[PDB]
Amino acid sequence: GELAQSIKELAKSIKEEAWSIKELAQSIKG
Amino acid sequence: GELAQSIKELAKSIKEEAWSIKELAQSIKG
Amino acid sequence: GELAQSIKELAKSIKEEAWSIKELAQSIKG
Amino acid sequence: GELAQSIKELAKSIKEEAWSIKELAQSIKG
Amino acid sequence: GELAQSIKELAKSIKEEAWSIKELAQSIKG
Amino acid sequence: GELAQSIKELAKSIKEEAWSIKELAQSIKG
Amino acid sequence: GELAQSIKELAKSIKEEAWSIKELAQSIKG
């Protein structure tokens, strides 16, 4: 139910953050 | 409940800990 | 009882973390 | 019992993390 | 059940984030 | 039992993360 | 059971993240 759903939303947000951090790394890189 | 009664706030705090990321993931792109 | 109380404490801590991540987002954005 | 105790320990650790993220925000802001 | 699954998804996302943070560190390094 | 133990392990890892974030804060401040 | 296992996986991932954040701190410090 709602708890599991919330944790899935959190997991999704952290994936988005991971993607942004990768983009920041790529922008610093050559 | 709170966490996402208690579990319920838990869902609230875990969901809200999810928004909070969407704004980081996002602040780092810009 | 004690279990419900512990989960309420957890929910509170996750809200504090959400607030800090919001602050981190704002500091990056500024 | 032990479960409630473990969740209290988890809540404490998350508060520590929230404090560290706030400190990271302050260091970026300064 | 669904709860365990959600936590597994969270664990996966955090590993991705850890990898991205490592990449950001490598890009800063030199 | 095993559940409480797992949550204690999770609490430990989150403390280590909080320590690293504190170190990141100190490195930015310096 | 599977829940405890999932939480153990989460704990491991957060340790990996702590290590990466430490590496990011080291790269900023250098």
Author numbering:
A (entry chain G), B (entry chain A), C (entry chain B), D (entry chain C), E (entry chain F), F (entry chain D), ...: 1 to 30
Direct quotes from the study:
CCs are quaternary structures comprising two or more α-helices supercoiled around each other with cyclic (Cn) or dihedral (Dn) symmetry. Here, we describe variants with all combinations of the aliphatic residues, Ile, Leu and Val, at a and d to give four classes of peptide: the ββ class, with a and d = Ile or Val; Lβ, a = Leu and d = Ile or Val; βL, a = Ile or Val and d = Leu; and LL, a = d = Leu. Peptides are named systematically appending the one-letter code for the amino acids at the a and d sites to “CC-Type2-“; e.g., CC-Hept becomes CC-Type2-LI. In summary, solution-phase data and X-ray crystal structures demonstrate conclusively that different classes of Type-2 coiled-coil (CC) peptides—i.e., based on abcdefg repeats with predominantly hydrophobic residues at a, d, e and g—adopt a range of distinct states.
To explore this switch between assembling open α-helical barrels and collapsed CCs, we tested if examples of some of the latter could be opened by introducing polar residues into the hydrophobic repeats of βL and LL sequences. Specifically, we mutated the centremost Leu at d (position 17) to Glu to give CC-Type2-IL-Sg-L17E and CC-Type2-LL-L17E. However, unlike the parents, they had accessible thermal unfolding transitions. Both transitions were pH dependent with stabilities increasing sharply below pH 6–7. Neither of the L17E peptides bound DPH, but both sequestered its cationic derivative trimethyl-ammonium DPH (TMA-DPH) with μM affinities suggesting that the barrel states are accessible. Thus, L17E expands the collapsed hexamer of CC-Type2-IL to include a seventh helix and to reveal an accessible central channel. The experiments and calculations for CC-Type2-IL-Sg-L17E were similar; although, as expected for an open barrel, for a given charge state the macroscopic pKa values were lower than for the collapsed structure of CC-Type2-LL-L17E. For CC-Type2-IL-Sg-L17E, the central cavity was hydrated throughout the simulation. Thus, both the IL and LL backgrounds can switch and open to access barrel states. Moreover, this state appears to be more accessible to IL, fitting our contention that β-branched residues at a and d promote the α-helical-barrel state.
